[PDB]
Structure 1
């Protein structure tokens, strides 16, 4: 009762009919009273000569007074009264609600344009938090509603709160909710949706200073008040799922869970510590009866493993990560594909694992469903060669990859062929050899042989494909005279006898093909001018060319596309194309100009009974067998003895090659040595 400090303000605050107080006088008085109360020290203060105003500052005439100033000052005063009297809690619950609706109003106006009393309201909110009087709001019979309202105030989009207060707003909402056991779903929708509805980094721009109250608030709550929020997050997940589930609309559940998963994915990125609150649901979702939810859960954890996080998922939540890798054996193929689709990014984003991955992909590469096998080989296509070489190391993967090249299934086989070839190419142009990676190389080095062995299956499409693929990735057409050979040897380095016999056969055919296209043009030129409509050979040469064209078209998958193509070329009867074509097949051409005639030739055919595109894809593959690429001025480079001694594995190839080049057709071979002499 007795104190050293004392309230020195004693002016009336209530306007009656007998004695009236002007609005301005009342404003000034309430200002004074506010300023004075603020200064008061809680412990050292009379407090007895203050009930007068305790009783006065709750009059509805002031609570709902027109002038905002009176209301704001009243708010502050009451803020202080609460602070001084506590922990006695002088007002009754009713009065306290009446006060706390006023404070909410003040908070509401705080986000509005300045009413000239922003400062008072700043004081209000700050001091309501500092002295923790705010939480009184929670012990009221209307607390839930007041909570919802309190939250809607600050999360309202139409309000513009300054950034300075965000830490305070997160405080207010922090404390007020820390007193709650069961928070209304509404508030939680409010708090959590902000993760969905506000994604930074979405608009590339100059400063991105824009910022958002509700989001930072959500972060403050989910970071600073994690321990109390997690409990609710769990309830949010379960309740939302529960709500969607029992919904009359039967197609909502999936749509909402797919959203929850996004909420989760964001939380993991922003506040990974919270994910613990719902990780169990996911864990159980992976093993759910409905395949779709397993698919989604798989996709989710798939997304998680590729996201930047201060925390580490496999360390933190190994339990479910194991359950994640456990989905390479899910009954539903869709789930397996869903899993397998995620690896490239994972590998591309984390080296954390090369153990379970290598364990899993091995099974994924020999799965009964061709979709997953395709999605498996797609790895070698989508993620860069280097990261493959670094991350995946299991023997079985490569063997299976190459193994599928002989598979019945077409769509897999083709992709396989193309992939492992482009891979072979890239797997030499980027990765060198050491003492430890050579262990798998004996597989990457048997790629060309394997490729060349496909010819033995005798399929037109496959032969066409291998033809196309070899000259695309293996034996390229660029970029110089020496390295083509240097690599050529490395391609020939690891061959079995079959690979050599086929390699040579393919070359033995080239001369017979050249001897055919040359005569093809020599016979096609017959329509340059009238030589014999029915004269010299009219009745006989037409049926030599006509029947000759079938010979070259007997090796192509779609002969009816071949016989049609070149006849239209006879329809053309343009000399340029004939000169280039003829030039490509005549044998003995410097390697460099061949490229020049070929590229222009193919480019020329583009964009002029059906589309020429065909004719291009026909004559190109047809040329790959027809023209000389390997037996040419390369000879001159193999001729130069690159090494005095050593490198026996190179000289035996020099031999293997030249020995044959001298045998298949020596019209070219014996001449260079003559030039050398």
Structure 2
């Protein structure tokens, strides 16, 4: 009651019919009153000689007064009233509501354009926080309605709050909510959806100085007030799920859970702590009755592991990560596939595990559904070869890969082959050997031997495929004379006898196919001009050409594309092509020029009964059996002894090779030693 400081303002504030106050006198009076109350000290202040204005500033004539200045100074005064009288809480709840609806007005005007009193409204929000008089809002009968309104205001798109106040706002909403045990769902929608809607790094641009109020706010509420927001977050998930499950719209439920899941994933990237608040439901969802909710749940965790995060998932919630690697044994395949589809991105983005994976993929490469097996090998394609050698190590993975190459199922087998061959070449041009990694290398080295044992099954499509594959990746046509042979030996290094006999057999057919494409052009040139319409051999040469073109088509899967392609070439009867063709099969061609004859020949055939794209894919695989790639000017290189002594695993090949090249045809063999002589 008696203090060292005291209130010095004593001018009337209420305008009556008796004594009236013009607007501008009132504005300056309230300006003074406001300015004075700010400087007071809550403790060493009179407080008694102040009830005069305590009662005055609540007259509905000032609250809902027109001039914005008056309302704004009326507020700033009332802000200090509470502050000073607190904790006694001078006003009744009804007044307090009428007051707190006015403060919601001033906040509303704070994001708008300047009314000339933005400062007065900046004072208001900041002080209501500092002296925490704000939380008086939560002991009212309408607090829920108010709480909603308060939120809708700052989370309103149509308002432009400056970036200075974001800290303050977050504080305001932060305190006021800590006072609630059960927060209305409408609010929580507002807060959380702001993670879904505003994604940063979405548009690439100059500065991204854009920024957003509501976003930065929900960060503040979930980081700082994690402890109290985490209680509420759990209510959101359950309520939302509860709302959509019981929705008449039966198919809503899936759509919202797929949305809830996306909400979670943003949070792990920003405030991973909060995941705890719902990591439960996910665990129960993985074991849900409904395979779709299990599928979606799987997908989710799958994404999580790939995400940058200050925290680490498997550590924090190992409870569930073990349930996740438990889904490689689910009943529903649609679930098993969704698991495997995510692996390639995980491995690329983390090395955390290589144990639960190397335990799991060994079960995935041998599942009963062929869909997953395709998803597994697609790893060896999708993720780079380096990462593979690093992360996956388990023996059983590399064995089961090569094993599917002899599988009945087609779509697997094909992808399997093209995969395990494009792997082998990368696995030599990149990864080097050591005292330890040479452990699994024995398997990577026996790939080319595997591929050759496929000829023995005697299919056309496969024999066409292995043909197309080997010359693509294993034995390329590039880039030099020497490194072809260097790698060619390393290919033959780990061969069994079948691999050799078939390796030698394929090459023994190269000379018998050459004698057939050569005597094809010599028989296909018979329609160049009128030799024998029915003269010299007309009735017997047309039936030796026509019955010889089948001999080369009998080994092609679609022979009804093979005898089709080369009679439209007698229809073209274009000599340029005949020369490039004849030049590839004629044996003993410098390996370099063969490449040039061969490359122009395939590019020329693209875009002139049915499509010539077919003729390009038929000739290409047929040429692989006709022309000399391996038996050529490489002999000169295997001739030059790379090594004087040592490399008994290289010279027994040099023999093995040269030992055969002289036998299949010494038309080419015995001549290079007369030049060397």
What TM-score do you get using the length of structure 1 for normalisation? 1.00
- TM-superposed CA distance for 1:389, in Å, is 0.5
* Structure 1, unpaired ranges of 5+: none
- TM-superposed CA distance for 1:229, in Å, is 0.2
- TM-superposed CA distance for 1:197, in Å, is 0.5
- TM-superposed CA distance for 1:98, in Å, is 0.4
Once the two structures are superposed, what CA deviation does each residue of 1:75-131 show, in whole Å capped at 9, x if it has no partner? 000000010000000000000000000000000000000000000111000000000
Distance (whole Å) between structure 2 residues aligned to residue 329 and residue 645 of structure 1: 55
Once the two structures are superposed, what CA deviation does each residue of 1:487-517 show, in whole Å capped at 9, x if it has no partner? 0000000000000000000000000000000
Distance (whole Å) between structure 2 residues aligned to residue 400 and residue 531 of structure 1: 59
Q: What secondary structure is seen at the aligned counterpart in 1 of 2:642? A: coil
- TM-superposed CA distance for 1:29, in Å, is 0.2
Distance (whole Å) between structure 2 residues aligned to residue 391 and residue 69 of structure 1: 68
Once the two structures are superposed, what CA deviation does each residue of 1:217-274 show, in whole Å capped at 9, x if it has no partner? 0000000000000000000000000000000000100000000000000001000000
- TM-superposed CA distance for 1:484, in Å, is 0.2
- TM-superposed CA distance for 1:668, in Å, is 0.4
Distance (whole Å) between structure 2 residues aligned to residue 453 and residue 670 of structure 1: 31
Trace 1:71-86 onto structure 2 (pairs within 5 A). Answer: 71-86=71-86
Trace 1:161-172 onto structure 2 (pairs within 5 A). Answer: 161-172=161-172
Q: What secondary structure is seen at the aligned counterpart in 2 of 1:557? A: coil
- TM-superposed CA distance for 1:360, in Å, is 0.5
Distance (whole Å) between structure 2 residues aligned to residue 89 and residue 64 of structure 1: 23
Distance (whole Å) between structure 1 residues aligned to residue 215 and residue 603 of structure 2: 56
Distance (whole Å) between structure 1 residues aligned to residue 5 and residue 97 of structure 2: 30
Distance (whole Å) between structure 1 residues aligned to residue 651 and residue 359 of structure 2: 41
- TM-superposed CA distance for 1:405, in Å, is 0.2
RMSD: 0.3
Q: What secondary structure is seen at the aligned counterpart in 1 of 2:165? A: helix
- TM-superposed CA distance for 1:325, in Å, is 0.4
- TM-superposed CA distance for 1:448, in Å, is 0.2
- TM-superposed CA distance for 1:183, in Å, is 0.2
Q: What secondary structure is seen at the aligned counterpart in 1 of 2:636? A: helix
Q: Which residue of 2 aligns with 1:321?
A: 321
Once the two structures are superposed, what CA deviation does each residue of 1:141-166 show, in whole Å capped at 9, x if it has no partner? 00001000000000000000000000
Distance (whole Å) between structure 2 residues aligned to residue 100 and residue 517 of structure 1: 96
Once the two structures are superposed, what CA deviation does each residue of 1:7-66 show, in whole Å capped at 9, x if it has no partner? 000000000000000100000000000000000000000000000000000000000000
Q: Which residue of 2 aligns with 1:515?
A: 515
* Structure 2, unpaired ranges of 5+: none
- TM-superposed CA distance for 1:521, in Å, is 0.2
- TM-superposed CA distance for 1:533, in Å, is 0.2
- TM-superposed CA distance for 1:396, in Å, is 0.3
Q: What secondary structure is seen at the aligned counterpart in 2 of 1:617? A: helix
Q: Which residue of 2 aligns with 1:234?
A: 234
- TM-superposed CA distance for 1:627, in Å, is 0.1
Distance (whole Å) between structure 2 residues aligned to residue 283 and residue 603 of structure 1: 56
Distance (whole Å) between structure 1 residues aligned to residue 235 and residue 9 of structure 2: 51
- TM-superposed CA distance for 1:344, in Å, is 0.2
Distance (whole Å) between structure 2 residues aligned to residue 668 and residue 569 of structure 1: 31
Q: Which residue of 2 aligns with 1:433?
A: 433
- TM-superposed CA distance for 1:545, in Å, is 0.2
Distance (whole Å) between structure 2 residues aligned to residue 141 and residue 666 of structure 1: 106
Runs of at least 4 residues of structure 1 off by over 2 A? none
Trace 1:430-509 onto structure 2 (pairs within 5 A). Answer: 430-509=430-509
- TM-superposed CA distance for 1:618, in Å, is 0.3
Distance (whole Å) between structure 2 residues aligned to residue 229 and residue 54 of structure 1: 36
Once the two structures are superposed, what CA deviation does each residue of 1:398-450 show, in whole Å capped at 9, x if it has no partner? 10000000000000000000000000010111100001101000000000000
- TM-superposed CA distance for 1:374, in Å, is 0.2
Once the two structures are superposed, what CA deviation does each residue of 1:152-206 show, in whole Å capped at 9, x if it has no partner? 0000000000000000000000000000000000000000000001000000000
- TM-superposed CA distance for 1:586, in Å, is 0.3
Once the two structures are superposed, what CA deviation does each residue of 1:562-589 show, in whole Å capped at 9, x if it has no partner? 0010000011111010000000000000
Q: What secondary structure is seen at the aligned counterpart in 2 of 1:597? A: helix
Q: Where is the helix percentage greater, Structure 1 or Structure 2? A: 1
- TM-superposed CA distance for 1:654, in Å, is 0.2
Q: What secondary structure is seen at the aligned counterpart in 1 of 2:566? A: helix
Distance (whole Å) between structure 2 residues aligned to residue 190 and residue 675 of structure 1: 88
Once the two structures are superposed, what CA deviation does each residue of 1:443-492 show, in whole Å capped at 9, x if it has no partner? 00000000000000000000000000000000000000000000000000
Distance (whole Å) between structure 2 residues aligned to residue 118 and residue 162 of structure 1: 11
Once the two structures are superposed, what CA deviation does each residue of 1:286-315 show, in whole Å capped at 9, x if it has no partner? 000000000000000000000000000000
Distance (whole Å) between structure 1 residues aligned to residue 195 and residue 459 of structure 2: 56
Once the two structures are superposed, what CA deviation does each residue of 1:514-562 show, in whole Å capped at 9, x if it has no partner? 0000000000000000000000000000000000000000000000100
Distance (whole Å) between structure 2 residues aligned to residue 398 and residue 219 of structure 1: 46
Distance (whole Å) between structure 1 residues aligned to residue 621 and residue 42 of structure 2: 94
Distance (whole Å) between structure 1 residues aligned to residue 414 and residue 15 of structure 2: 93
Pair 1:214 & 2:214 matched: yes
Distance (whole Å) between structure 2 residues aligned to residue 475 and residue 674 of structure 1: 29
Q: What secondary structure is seen at the aligned counterpart in 2 of 1:151? A: helix
Q: Which residue of 2 aligns with 1:596?
A: 596
Q: What secondary structure is seen at the aligned counterpart in 2 of 1:38? A: helix
Pair 1:95 & 2:84 matched: no
Distance (whole Å) between structure 2 residues aligned to residue 479 and residue 370 of structure 1: 38
Distance (whole Å) between structure 1 residues aligned to residue 21 and residue 149 of structure 2: 33
What TM-score do you get using the length of structure 2 for normalisation? 1.00
- TM-superposed CA distance for 1:621, in Å, is 0.1
Distance (whole Å) between structure 2 residues aligned to residue 197 and residue 24 of structure 1: 46
Distance (whole Å) between structure 1 residues aligned to residue 276 and residue 428 of structure 2: 45
Distance (whole Å) between structure 2 residues aligned to residue 588 and residue 268 of structure 1: 65
Distance (whole Å) between structure 2 residues aligned to residue 428 and residue 292 of structure 1: 43
Once the two structures are superposed, what CA deviation does each residue of 1:330-386 show, in whole Å capped at 9, x if it has no partner? 000010000000000000000000000110000000000000000000000000000
Distance (whole Å) between structure 2 residues aligned to residue 100 and residue 588 of structure 1: 97
- Work out the number of aligned pairs and report it: 677
- TM-superposed CA distance for 1:597, in Å, is 0.3
Pair 1:671 & 2:671 matched: yes
Distance (whole Å) between structure 2 residues aligned to residue 430 and residue 173 of structure 1: 57
Distance (whole Å) between structure 2 residues aligned to residue 653 and residue 233 of structure 1: 70
